[PDB]
Amino acid sequence: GVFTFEDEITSTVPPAKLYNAMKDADSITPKIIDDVKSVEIVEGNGGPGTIKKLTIVEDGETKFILHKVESIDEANYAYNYSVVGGVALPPTAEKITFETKLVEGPNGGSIGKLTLKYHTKGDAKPDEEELKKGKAKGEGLFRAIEGYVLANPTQY
Numbered sequence: 001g002v003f004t005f006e007d008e009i010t011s012t013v014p015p016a017k018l019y020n021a022m023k024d025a026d027s028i029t030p031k032i033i034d035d036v037k038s039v040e041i042v043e044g045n046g047g048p049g050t051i052k053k054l055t056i057v058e059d060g061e062t063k064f065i066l067h068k069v070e071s072i073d074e075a076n077y078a079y080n081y082s083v084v085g086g087v088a089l090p091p092t093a094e095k096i097t098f099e100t101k102l103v104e105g106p107n108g109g110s111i112g113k114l115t116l117k118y119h120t121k122g123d124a125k126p127d128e129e130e131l132k133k134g135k136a137k138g139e140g141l142f143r144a145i146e147g148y149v150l151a152n153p154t155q156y
């Protein structure tokens with residue numbers, strides 16, 4: 001099954017900047033996110049379809065996560081990817097999709113929508129703690145991109 005969740009968020013950073021820095025996540029994320037050590041392309045140019053392998057360290061053990069770039073839409077300031085391999089996918093989870101879409105906010109900032117789509121196998125529903133972790137991870141990546149923009153204003 002597919003179980004979709006949406007959270008609304010806010011940022012002081014304008015949406016064009018945030019969108020441009022989302023597309024630089026491969027380089028931003030391992031600097032800012034401690035446990036993210038590297039992101040390499042397995043196949044593709046970085047566009048929709050691209051498979052990426054992330055190396056992380058959790059509890060001082062090296063682990064690997066697989067991401068697929070799903071879609072990137074400048075007209076909706078939208079950047080979308082899926083976890084398709086590694087720790088976040090227990091046996092009844094087939095894939096977890098993270099979408100981020102941005103609109104113009106008040107005061108030169110942004111309103112964000114974070115969508116999490118949790119694809120289960122068969123009639124399985126998503127586990128509630130998994131959901132909770134999925135949501136935290138999604139919000140974390142967003143704040144990492146945001147934090148980077150805020151701390152490095154001349155780059156965007």
Ligand code: NA
Pocket residue numbers: 029030031032033034035036037
């Ligand atoms: Na890191």
